[PDB]
């Protein structure tokens, strides 16, 4: 019966700018492990917001810090992603049902791609939180897609790599942090939800699309994340 | 003026088996975040030993746990690695002077390979600890090499990838955890030393070589790590 502590994560500063703005509360800035954590109070909940910096190691570190140093009981991720599928268009919102580290390769020992011993290819997120996301989206008449998100330490900008992600993992979107965030949460038994809004199509024009749409797509995701926190 | 707390990390159980045996003290087993931490007392020092499990996310998580949950003031890594250079042979010992995440690719935005914004290509380890390693090796007439270690989430077993690591990063050895361990330590200001003993040549026969030499190479590294702790 303490105050609920909720971790809110993006990868880049641009993904958390709209989060901080939308909550509209005063935040205390707390430096730790190369991150700045923004700690505020919102409707009987303590919210801790940070951007991890890009990629798997950064996001793993920051999620672990949120859990161990700030005692968060849930983690919600908001940011942008590349679309791997024709029906996911720029600005569309996706909730990740499972995530994979698409760049993991222990095939020299006959392991399937994505697999590491003492783990699994696919990492699950919270069914209760994903159900909440879907409930809210239906009530607000927001198209919310669901699917597998692939995460790796490369910005994907080729037809060939996109097609690999679809064929190998049946992934719908690609990014560089979701799987590591969801993985850390699974290891600590912390409920996790990963939201992404599409910024690009992970093809040869992805860099230019990303730079154009980062702000808008980040805001779309942030607004939805806030609507979830309103129901926690 | 408290007791010095030292984190001792391997990636696989096999890399820490000789560590636990060689210290020869009683350890309390403490589960946290999917790892088991072995906490013992050795010569006015508290030693916390764990294996992270394989790869960058696992090792990032465990190093962060060591620092935040166990309060370690230094981190020493011991394990095995693939050789990228003719003069590093099976069983040889290497101390990593810098490390890189060799699989990071943000070249779509004209970043050099290995680079992430708000970080650097090369991560340094502790000069004071590396100097200690070299001093001990010279006193014991142990050949200790030094160089760049490349870390990524793939087991390297091809001429083509080996040559890339040498050309791109001037790396001497390859593994899947050193850069992430050293990175976490840098972010928290914790001195880090990464030791590796060669298990294979990162070529088409690397899997078979690794399985053959894991035990012996792990022990070689562990023995050297213990000799360092004896001087702390
Ligand atoms: C320098 C620089 C920016 S790297 C890209 C950011 C955006 N994010 C999501 C993302 C959006 N589009 C992507 C794509 N095509 N591939 C990987 N990841 C993504 C992954 C990284 O945090
Ligand atoms: C399944 C399974 C085992 S994956 C290999 C282990 C050994 N380690 C070091 C290592 C030794 N040789 C290597 C190589 N050729 N490539 C990458 N890493 C390494 C990296 C991983 O922890
Ligand atoms: N990776």
Coordinates of C-alpha atoms and ligand atoms in Angstrom, one line a residue:
Chain A
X1 CA 0.0 0.0 0.0
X2 CA 2.8 2.5 -0.8
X3 CA 2.7 4.9 -3.8
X4 CA 2.9 3.0 -7.1
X5 CA 6.3 3.7 -8.7
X6 CA 6.3 3.6 -12.6
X7 CA 9.4 3.7 -14.8
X8 CA 8.9 5.5 -18.1
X9 CA 11.7 5.0 -20.7
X10 CA 12.6 6.2 -24.1
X11 CA 15.9 5.7 -26.0
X12 CA 16.6 9.2 -27.2
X13 CA 16.0 12.6 -25.5
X14 CA 13.5 13.4 -28.3
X15 CA 11.4 10.4 -27.2
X16 CA 11.0 11.7 -23.6
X17 CA 10.6 15.4 -24.4
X18 CA 6.9 15.0 -25.2
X19 CA 6.5 12.7 -22.1
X20 CA 7.9 15.3 -19.7
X21 CA 5.7 18.0 -21.4
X22 CA 2.5 15.9 -21.4
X23 CA 2.7 14.9 -17.7
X24 CA 3.1 18.6 -17.0
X25 CA 4.4 18.1 -13.4
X26 CA 7.6 19.3 -11.7
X27 CA 10.4 16.8 -12.0
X28 CA 13.5 16.4 -9.8
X29 CA 16.6 15.5 -12.0
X30 CA 18.7 12.8 -10.5
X31 CA 22.0 11.7 -12.2
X32 CA 23.0 8.0 -11.9
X33 CA 25.2 5.8 -14.2
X34 CA 25.3 8.3 -17.0
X35 CA 21.6 8.8 -17.2
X36 CA 19.4 11.6 -15.8
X37 CA 16.2 10.4 -14.1
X38 CA 13.3 12.8 -13.9
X39 CA 11.3 12.0 -10.7
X40 CA 7.8 13.4 -10.3
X41 CA 4.4 12.8 -8.7
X42 CA 1.2 12.3 -10.8
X43 CA -2.2 11.1 -9.4
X44 CA -1.0 9.0 -6.4
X45 CA 1.9 7.6 -8.6
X46 CA 5.6 8.4 -8.6
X47 CA 6.8 8.5 -12.2
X48 CA 10.5 8.2 -13.0
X49 CA 11.3 9.2 -16.6
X50 CA 14.6 8.8 -18.5
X51 CA 16.1 8.3 -21.9
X52 CA 18.6 5.4 -21.9
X53 CA 20.7 6.5 -25.0
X54 CA 20.6 4.4 -28.1
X55 CA 20.9 0.6 -28.3
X56 CA 20.9 -2.6 -26.3
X57 CA 23.7 -2.0 -23.7
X58 CA 22.4 1.6 -22.9
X59 CA 18.8 0.4 -22.5
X60 CA 19.8 -2.6 -20.5
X61 CA 21.7 -0.4 -18.1
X62 CA 19.0 2.2 -17.6
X63 CA 16.2 -0.3 -17.1
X64 CA 18.3 -2.1 -14.5
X65 CA 19.0 1.2 -12.7
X66 CA 15.3 2.1 -12.8
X67 CA 14.5 -1.2 -11.1
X68 CA 17.3 -1.4 -8.5
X69 CA 17.9 2.3 -7.7
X70 CA 14.4 3.7 -8.1
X71 CA 12.3 0.7 -7.1
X72 CA 9.9 0.9 -10.1
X73 CA 7.1 -1.7 -10.0
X74 CA 6.3 -1.4 -13.8
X75 CA 8.2 -0.2 -16.8
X76 CA 6.5 1.5 -19.8
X77 CA 8.6 2.2 -22.9
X78 CA 7.7 4.8 -25.5
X79 CA 9.5 5.7 -28.7
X80 CA 9.7 5.3 -32.4
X81 CA 10.4 2.3 -34.7
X82 CA 10.9 1.2 -38.3
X83 CA 8.0 -0.6 -40.0
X84 CA 8.6 -4.1 -41.5
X85 CA 5.1 -4.6 -42.8
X86 CA 2.9 -2.8 -45.4
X87 CA 0.0 -2.2 -43.0
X88 CA 2.2 -0.4 -40.4
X89 CA 2.5 3.2 -41.8
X90 CA 4.3 6.3 -40.6
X91 CA 2.8 7.4 -37.2
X92 CA 1.0 4.1 -36.6
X93 CA 1.2 2.8 -33.0
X94 CA 2.3 -0.7 -32.2
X95 CA 2.3 -2.5 -28.8
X96 CA 5.0 -5.3 -28.7
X97 CA 3.6 -8.7 -27.7
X98 CA 7.0 -10.4 -27.9
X99 CA 10.4 -9.1 -28.7
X100 CA 13.6 -10.6 -30.0
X101 CA 17.3 -9.7 -30.2
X102 CA 17.6 -10.1 -33.9
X103 CA 21.3 -9.8 -34.1
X104 CA 22.2 -12.6 -31.7
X105 CA 24.0 -15.4 -33.5
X106 CA 25.2 -18.6 -31.8
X107 CA 24.5 -20.7 -34.9
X108 CA 28.1 -22.0 -34.7
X109 CA 26.7 -24.3 -31.9
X110 CA 23.4 -25.0 -33.8
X111 CA 21.4 -22.6 -31.8
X112 CA 18.6 -20.8 -33.8
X113 CA 19.2 -17.1 -34.5
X114 CA 18.1 -14.9 -31.5
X115 CA 18.7 -17.7 -29.0
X116 CA 21.1 -17.6 -26.0
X117 CA 21.5 -20.4 -23.5
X118 CA 19.6 -19.9 -20.3
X119 CA 17.2 -17.5 -22.2
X120 CA 14.8 -17.7 -25.1
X121 CA 14.4 -16.3 -28.6
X122 CA 11.2 -14.4 -27.7
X123 CA 10.7 -12.2 -24.6
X124 CA 7.2 -11.6 -23.5
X125 CA 5.7 -8.3 -22.2
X126 CA 2.9 -8.0 -19.7
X127 CA -0.4 -9.4 -20.7
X128 CA -2.3 -7.3 -18.3
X129 CA -0.7 -4.1 -19.6
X130 CA -1.1 -5.1 -23.2
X131 CA -4.8 -5.8 -22.5
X132 CA -5.1 -2.3 -20.9
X133 CA -3.5 -0.7 -24.0
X134 CA -5.9 -2.5 -26.3
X135 CA -8.9 -1.5 -24.1
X136 CA -7.9 2.1 -24.1
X137 CA -7.2 2.1 -27.9
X138 CA -10.6 0.6 -28.6
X139 CA -12.3 3.2 -26.4
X140 CA -10.5 6.1 -28.0
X141 CA -10.9 4.8 -31.6
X142 CA -7.1 4.6 -32.0
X143 CA -5.7 2.0 -34.3
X144 CA -3.3 0.1 -32.2
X145 CA -1.5 -2.7 -33.8
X146 CA 0.2 -5.5 -32.0
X147 CA 3.1 -7.8 -33.0
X148 CA 6.6 -8.9 -32.6
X149 CA 9.3 -6.3 -32.4
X150 CA 12.9 -7.0 -33.4
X151 CA 15.7 -5.2 -31.6
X152 CA 19.4 -5.0 -32.5
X153 CA 22.4 -2.7 -32.4
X154 CA 22.0 -1.7 -36.1
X155 CA 19.8 1.0 -37.7
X156 CA 18.1 -1.1 -40.4
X157 CA 17.9 0.6 -43.8
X158 CA 17.9 -2.2 -46.4
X159 CA 15.3 -4.4 -48.1
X160 CA 17.5 -7.5 -47.4
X161 CA 17.7 -7.0 -43.7
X162 CA 13.9 -6.1 -43.4
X163 CA 13.1 -9.4 -45.2
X164 CA 15.3 -11.4 -42.9
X165 CA 13.5 -10.0 -39.9
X166 CA 10.2 -10.9 -41.3
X167 CA 11.2 -14.4 -42.5
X168 CA 13.3 -15.3 -39.3
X169 CA 11.2 -13.8 -36.5
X170 CA 7.9 -12.7 -38.1
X171 CA 8.6 -9.3 -36.8
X172 CA 6.4 -6.3 -37.5
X173 CA 8.7 -3.5 -36.5
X174 CA 12.4 -2.9 -35.8
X175 CA 14.2 -0.8 -33.2
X176 CA 17.3 -1.0 -30.9
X177 CA 16.0 -1.2 -27.3
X178 CA 12.7 -2.9 -26.8
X179 CA 14.0 -6.5 -26.4
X180 CA 16.6 -5.5 -23.9
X181 CA 14.2 -3.4 -21.8
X182 CA 11.6 -6.3 -21.8
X183 CA 14.4 -8.7 -21.0
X184 CA 15.6 -6.9 -17.9
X185 CA 12.0 -6.5 -16.7
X186 CA 11.4 -10.3 -17.2
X187 CA 14.6 -11.1 -15.2
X188 CA 13.4 -8.9 -12.2
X189 CA 9.7 -9.9 -12.5
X190 CA 8.7 -6.4 -13.4
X191 CA 5.7 -5.9 -15.7
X192 CA 6.7 -4.2 -18.9
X193 CA 4.8 -2.7 -21.9
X194 CA 6.7 -1.5 -25.1
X195 CA 5.0 1.1 -27.3
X196 CA 6.4 2.3 -30.6
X197 CA 5.2 4.7 -33.2
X198 CA 6.5 4.2 -36.8
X199 CA 9.1 6.8 -38.0
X200 CA 10.3 5.1 -41.2
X201 CA 10.1 1.9 -43.3
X202 CA 13.6 0.5 -42.4
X203 CA 14.6 0.7 -46.0
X204 CA 17.1 2.7 -48.0
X205 CA 15.3 6.0 -47.2
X206 CA 14.9 5.3 -43.5
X207 CA 17.5 7.7 -42.3
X208 CA 15.8 10.7 -44.0
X209 CA 12.3 9.5 -42.9
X210 CA 13.5 9.1 -39.3
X211 CA 14.9 12.6 -39.2
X212 CA 11.6 14.0 -40.6
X213 CA 9.2 12.1 -38.4
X214 CA 11.0 11.5 -35.1
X215 CA 9.2 14.4 -33.3
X216 CA 5.7 13.6 -34.5
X217 CA 6.0 9.8 -34.0
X218 CA 7.6 10.3 -30.5
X219 CA 4.7 12.5 -29.5
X220 CA 2.1 10.0 -30.8
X221 CA 3.7 7.3 -28.7
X222 CA 4.1 9.6 -25.7
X223 CA 0.4 10.6 -25.7
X224 CA -0.7 7.0 -25.7
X225 CA 1.7 6.1 -22.9
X226 CA 0.2 9.0 -20.8
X227 CA -3.3 7.6 -21.5
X228 CA -2.1 4.3 -20.1
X229 CA -0.6 5.8 -17.0
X230 CA -4.0 7.7 -16.4
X231 CA -5.6 4.2 -15.9
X232 CA -2.9 2.7 -13.6
Chain B
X1 CA 37.9 2.8 5.4
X2 CA 35.2 0.0 5.0
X3 CA 36.1 -3.4 3.6
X4 CA 37.0 -3.3 -0.1
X5 CA 34.2 -4.8 -2.2
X6 CA 35.4 -6.5 -5.4
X7 CA 33.1 -7.8 -8.2
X8 CA 34.4 -10.8 -10.1
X9 CA 32.6 -11.7 -13.3
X10 CA 32.6 -14.4 -15.9
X11 CA 30.1 -14.9 -18.7
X12 CA 29.5 -18.7 -18.4
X13 CA 29.3 -21.0 -15.4
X14 CA 32.5 -22.7 -16.6
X15 CA 34.4 -19.4 -16.4
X16 CA 33.6 -18.9 -12.7
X17 CA 33.9 -22.6 -11.5
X18 CA 37.7 -22.2 -11.3
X19 CA 37.3 -18.8 -9.6
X20 CA 35.2 -20.2 -6.8
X21 CA 37.5 -23.2 -6.4
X22 CA 40.7 -21.1 -6.4
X23 CA 39.6 -18.6 -3.7
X24 CA 38.6 -21.6 -1.6
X25 CA 36.4 -19.7 0.8
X26 CA 32.7 -20.2 1.8
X27 CA 30.3 -18.3 -0.4
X28 CA 26.7 -17.2 0.4
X29 CA 24.5 -17.6 -2.7
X30 CA 22.2 -14.6 -3.3
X31 CA 19.8 -14.6 -6.2
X32 CA 18.9 -11.3 -8.0
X33 CA 17.7 -10.4 -11.5
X34 CA 18.2 -14.0 -12.8
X35 CA 21.8 -14.2 -11.6
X36 CA 23.3 -16.0 -8.6
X37 CA 25.9 -13.9 -6.7
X38 CA 28.4 -15.7 -4.6
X39 CA 29.5 -13.5 -1.7
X40 CA 32.6 -14.3 0.4
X41 CA 35.4 -12.8 2.4
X42 CA 39.0 -13.1 1.4
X43 CA 42.0 -11.1 3.0
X44 CA 40.0 -8.0 4.3
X45 CA 38.0 -8.0 1.0
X46 CA 34.5 -8.9 0.2
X47 CA 34.4 -10.7 -3.1
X48 CA 31.2 -11.0 -5.1
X49 CA 31.4 -13.6 -7.9
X50 CA 28.9 -14.3 -10.6
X51 CA 28.5 -15.5 -14.2
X52 CA 26.3 -13.1 -16.2
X53 CA 25.2 -15.6 -18.9
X54 CA 26.3 -15.0 -22.5
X55 CA 26.3 -11.8 -24.5
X56 CA 26.0 -8.1 -24.2
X57 CA 22.5 -7.7 -22.5
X58 CA 23.2 -10.4 -19.9
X59 CA 26.6 -8.9 -19.0
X60 CA 25.3 -5.4 -18.9
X61 CA 22.6 -6.4 -16.5
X62 CA 24.8 -8.4 -14.2
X63 CA 27.5 -5.7 -14.0
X64 CA 24.9 -3.1 -13.2
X65 CA 23.5 -5.3 -10.4
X66 CA 27.0 -5.8 -9.0
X67 CA 27.5 -2.1 -8.8
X68 CA 24.0 -1.0 -7.5
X69 CA 23.0 -3.9 -5.4
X70 CA 26.3 -5.2 -4.1
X71 CA 28.2 -1.9 -3.9
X72 CA 31.4 -3.2 -5.6
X73 CA 34.2 -0.7 -5.9
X74 CA 36.1 -2.6 -8.7
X75 CA 35.1 -5.1 -11.3
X76 CA 37.5 -7.8 -12.6
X77 CA 36.3 -9.9 -15.5
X78 CA 37.8 -13.4 -16.2
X79 CA 37.0 -15.7 -19.1
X80 CA 37.9 -17.0 -22.5
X81 CA 38.1 -15.4 -26.0
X82 CA 38.8 -16.0 -29.7
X83 CA 42.2 -14.9 -31.0
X84 CA 42.3 -12.6 -34.0
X85 CA 46.1 -12.4 -34.3
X86 CA 48.8 -15.0 -35.1
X87 CA 50.8 -14.3 -31.9
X88 CA 47.8 -15.0 -29.6
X89 CA 47.7 -18.7 -29.3
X90 CA 45.4 -21.1 -27.4
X91 CA 45.8 -20.6 -23.6
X92 CA 47.5 -17.2 -23.9
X93 CA 46.4 -14.4 -21.6
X94 CA 45.3 -11.0 -22.7
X95 CA 44.4 -7.9 -20.8
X96 CA 42.1 -5.5 -22.7
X97 CA 43.3 -2.0 -22.9
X98 CA 40.3 -0.8 -24.8
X99 CA 37.1 -2.5 -25.9
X100 CA 34.6 -2.0 -28.7
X101 CA 31.1 -3.2 -29.5
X102 CA 32.0 -4.5 -33.0
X103 CA 28.4 -5.1 -34.1
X104 CA 27.1 -1.6 -33.6
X105 CA 26.1 0.0 -36.9
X106 CA 24.7 3.5 -37.2
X107 CA 26.4 4.0 -40.5
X108 CA 23.0 5.1 -42.0
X109 CA 23.7 8.4 -40.2
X110 CA 27.4 8.5 -41.2
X111 CA 28.6 7.3 -37.8
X112 CA 31.7 5.1 -37.8
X113 CA 31.1 1.5 -37.0
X114 CA 31.1 0.8 -33.2
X115 CA 30.0 4.4 -32.4
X116 CA 26.8 5.4 -30.6
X117 CA 25.9 9.1 -29.9
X118 CA 26.7 10.2 -26.4
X119 CA 29.3 7.4 -26.2
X120 CA 32.5 6.4 -28.0
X121 CA 33.9 3.6 -30.2
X122 CA 36.5 2.6 -27.7
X123 CA 35.9 2.0 -24.0
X124 CA 38.9 2.2 -21.7
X125 CA 39.6 0.0 -18.7
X126 CA 41.5 1.0 -15.6
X127 CA 45.1 2.0 -16.1
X128 CA 46.0 1.3 -12.5
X129 CA 44.6 -2.2 -12.7
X130 CA 46.2 -2.9 -16.1
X131 CA 49.5 -1.7 -14.7
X132 CA 49.1 -4.1 -11.8
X133 CA 48.4 -7.0 -14.2
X134 CA 51.5 -6.2 -16.1
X135 CA 53.6 -5.9 -13.0
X136 CA 52.4 -9.3 -11.7
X137 CA 52.9 -11.0 -15.0
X138 CA 56.5 -9.7 -15.3
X139 CA 57.2 -10.9 -11.7
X140 CA 55.7 -14.4 -12.4
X141 CA 57.3 -14.7 -15.9
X142 CA 53.9 -15.0 -17.4
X143 CA 53.4 -13.8 -21.0
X144 CA 50.6 -11.3 -20.7
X145 CA 49.6 -9.6 -23.9
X146 CA 47.6 -6.5 -24.1
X147 CA 45.3 -5.1 -26.8
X148 CA 41.9 -4.2 -28.1
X149 CA 39.1 -6.6 -27.5
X150 CA 36.0 -6.6 -29.7
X151 CA 32.7 -7.7 -28.2
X152 CA 29.5 -8.5 -30.0
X153 CA 26.4 -10.7 -29.8
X154 CA 27.8 -13.3 -32.4
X155 CA 30.2 -16.2 -31.9
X156 CA 32.8 -15.4 -34.6
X157 CA 33.8 -18.4 -36.7
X158 CA 34.8 -17.1 -40.1
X159 CA 37.9 -15.7 -41.7
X160 CA 35.9 -12.8 -43.2
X161 CA 34.5 -11.6 -39.8
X162 CA 38.0 -12.0 -38.2
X163 CA 39.6 -9.8 -40.8
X164 CA 36.9 -7.2 -40.4
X165 CA 37.6 -6.9 -36.7
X166 CA 41.3 -6.5 -37.3
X167 CA 40.8 -4.0 -40.2
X168 CA 38.1 -1.9 -38.6
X169 CA 39.1 -1.9 -34.9
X170 CA 42.6 -3.3 -34.7
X171 CA 41.3 -5.8 -32.3
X172 CA 43.4 -8.7 -31.0
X173 CA 40.7 -10.9 -29.5
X174 CA 36.9 -11.4 -29.8
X175 CA 34.3 -12.2 -27.2
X176 CA 30.7 -11.3 -26.3
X177 CA 30.8 -9.4 -23.0
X178 CA 34.0 -7.4 -22.3
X179 CA 32.9 -4.1 -23.9
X180 CA 29.5 -4.1 -22.1
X181 CA 31.1 -4.9 -18.7
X182 CA 33.7 -2.1 -19.2
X183 CA 31.1 0.3 -20.5
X184 CA 28.9 -0.2 -17.4
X185 CA 31.9 0.4 -15.2
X186 CA 32.8 3.5 -17.0
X187 CA 29.3 4.9 -16.6
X188 CA 29.4 4.4 -12.8
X189 CA 33.1 5.4 -12.4
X190 CA 34.1 1.9 -11.3
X191 CA 37.6 0.7 -12.1
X192 CA 37.4 -2.3 -14.4
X193 CA 40.0 -4.9 -15.7
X194 CA 39.1 -7.4 -18.4
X195 CA 41.2 -10.6 -18.6
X196 CA 40.7 -13.3 -21.3
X197 CA 42.5 -16.5 -22.1
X198 CA 42.4 -17.7 -25.7
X199 CA 40.1 -20.7 -26.4
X200 CA 40.0 -20.7 -30.2
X201 CA 41.0 -18.8 -33.3
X202 CA 37.6 -17.4 -34.2
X203 CA 37.6 -19.3 -37.5
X204 CA 35.7 -22.1 -39.1
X205 CA 36.9 -24.6 -36.4
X206 CA 36.3 -22.3 -33.5
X207 CA 33.3 -24.1 -32.1
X208 CA 35.2 -27.4 -31.7
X209 CA 38.3 -25.6 -30.3
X210 CA 36.1 -23.7 -27.8
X211 CA 34.5 -26.9 -26.5
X212 CA 37.9 -28.5 -26.2
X213 CA 39.7 -25.7 -24.4
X214 CA 37.0 -23.8 -22.4
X215 CA 38.0 -25.5 -19.1
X216 CA 41.7 -25.0 -19.4
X217 CA 41.6 -21.5 -20.8
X218 CA 39.0 -20.5 -18.1
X219 CA 41.3 -21.8 -15.4
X220 CA 44.3 -19.9 -16.8
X221 CA 42.4 -16.7 -16.7
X222 CA 41.0 -17.4 -13.2
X223 CA 44.4 -18.2 -11.7
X224 CA 45.7 -14.8 -13.0
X225 CA 42.6 -13.0 -11.7
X226 CA 43.2 -14.5 -8.3
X227 CA 46.9 -13.3 -8.4
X228 CA 45.6 -9.8 -9.0
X229 CA 43.1 -9.9 -6.1
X230 CA 46.0 -11.1 -3.9
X231 CA 47.6 -7.7 -4.5
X232 CA 44.5 -5.5 -4.0
Ligands
LIG1 C1 22.2 8.1 -34.6 C2 21.0 7.8 -34.5 C3 19.6 7.3 -34.3 S1 19.5 5.5 -34.3 C4 17.8 5.2 -34.3 C5 17.2 5.3 -32.9 C6 15.7 5.3 -33.1 N1 15.3 4.0 -32.6 C7 14.2 3.4 -33.3 C8 14.3 3.1 -34.8 C9 13.5 3.8 -35.7 N2 13.7 3.3 -37.0 C10 14.6 2.3 -37.0 C11 15.3 1.5 -37.9 N3 15.0 1.6 -39.2 N4 16.2 0.6 -37.4 C12 16.5 0.5 -36.1 N5 15.9 1.2 -35.2 C13 15.0 2.1 -35.6 C14 16.5 3.1 -32.4 C15 17.5 4.2 -32.0 O1 17.2 4.6 -30.6
LIG2 C1 26.5 -21.4 -26.8 C2 27.6 -20.9 -26.5 C3 28.9 -20.4 -26.2 S1 29.1 -18.8 -26.9 C4 30.8 -18.3 -26.6 C5 30.9 -17.8 -25.2 C6 32.4 -17.8 -24.9 N1 32.7 -16.3 -24.9 C7 34.1 -16.0 -25.5 C8 34.4 -16.5 -26.8 C9 35.4 -17.4 -27.1 N2 35.6 -17.6 -28.5 C10 34.8 -16.7 -29.1 C11 34.5 -16.4 -30.5 N3 35.1 -17.1 -31.5 N4 33.6 -15.5 -30.8 C12 32.9 -14.8 -29.8 N5 33.1 -15.0 -28.5 C13 34.0 -16.0 -28.1 C14 31.6 -15.6 -25.5 C15 30.5 -16.4 -25.0 O1 30.3 -16.1 -23.6
LIG3 N1 24.4 -6.7 -30.6

